[PDB]
């Protein structure tokens, strides 16, 4: 199996899981989303170790098994310096590939903008360069929901009654439509969702749920900076993704030479809805840019 341990980054203990591939061809670092979830739901990407790709997983600050820094450090900027400090501490000067999912994709983009010189490639899945845009698109999806659920979200969401049964029902319907399409949710996914509700990062940085971003990153938007990224980039997004293909398009437009793939019949957690297809696509991309 993989090796698990604690890395002293910026003064705090960060949990990481390094799954080395037999005949290593390259290293892939991963950034889970939320913000405030855990690496757990990205474990399906371990399959790539069979493709000669070593995958590094880690729980970001205040997430999962990792320690929580001062609240003042709950920022994407800190997350970027944490990722770099971890890369440097584990791989030194070796250049690696960086993959990010949702908020992790935003974190990956922020990282690339400042440290692309340390990367060989970039992969963004269900990621975003703009929170406001993501919010606007998610609101559109909410208006496409059945009246019942649409009114429940607006009514209780405006009164801050996220605990309400009717609201919970609307959230569930939305998730099975744009988060993880009607299937059989794996333990890895449930663990990440629970970790988010238990720690404090999600509530402070993100908000109550997936489609309600009232946290501290609500105005975050680096769409005007990502265009500086000049490294091979793979952008993936689900057809029914809660972070719409429109949002993905905005990233694709700014990154020259980047590739955009829209997974049909898939949503946000594409690495579980089409595990084989997802892992194949990423490994294909990685192996062509050594
Ligand atoms: C709403 C966005 C932050 C996306 C999603 N909550 C995630 O980062 O997993």
Curated annotation (Swiss-Prot):
Top-tier EC class: hydrolase
Transmembrane segments: none
Subunit structure: Part of the tricorn proteolytic complex.
Keyword terms, alphabetized: Aminopeptidase, Hydrolase, Protease
Example GO biological process: proteolysis
Catalysed reactions, as listed in the record: Release of N-terminal proline from a peptide
Annotated protein name in UniProt: Proline iminopeptidase
Ion transport keyword on record: no
């Amino acid at each position: 199996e993989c090796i698990e341990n604690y890395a002293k980054v910026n003064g705090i203990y960060i949990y990481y899981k390094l799954c080395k591939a037999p005949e290593e061809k390259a290293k892939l670092m991963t950034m889970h989303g939320g913000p405030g979830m855990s690496h757990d739901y990205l474990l399906s990407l371990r399959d790539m170790t069979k493709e000669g790709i070593t995958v590094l997983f880690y729980d970001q600050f205040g997430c999962g098994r990792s320690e929580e820094p001062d609240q003042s450090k709950f920022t994407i900027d800190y997350g970027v310096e944490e990722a770099e400090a971890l890369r440097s501490k584990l791989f030194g000067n070796e250049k690696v590939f960086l993959m990010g999912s949702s908020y992790g994709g935003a974190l990956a983009l922020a990282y690339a903008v400042k440290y692309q010189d340390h990367l060989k490639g970039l992969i963004v899945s269900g990621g975003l360069s703009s929170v406001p845009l993501t919010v606007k698109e998610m609101n559109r999806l909410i208006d496409e929901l059945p009246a019942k659920y649409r009114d429940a979200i607006k009514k209780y969401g405006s009164s801050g009654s996220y605990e309400n049964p009717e609201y919970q029902e609307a959230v569930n319907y939305f998730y099975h439509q744009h988060l993880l399409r009607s299937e059989d949710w794996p333990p890895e996914v449930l663990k990440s969702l629970e970790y988010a509700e238990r720690r404090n990062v999600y509530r402070i940085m993100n908000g109550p749920n997936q489609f309600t971003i009232t946290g501290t990153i609500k105005d975050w938007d680096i769409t005007d900076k990502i265009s500086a990224i000049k490294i091979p980039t793979l952008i993936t997004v689900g057809e029914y993704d809660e972070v719409t293909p429109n949002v993905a398009r905005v990233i694709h437009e700014k990154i020259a030479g980047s590739e955009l793939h829209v997974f049909r019949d898939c949503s946000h957690l594409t690495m579980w809805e089409d595990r084989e297809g997802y892992n194949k696509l990423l490994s294909d991309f990685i192996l062509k840019h050594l």
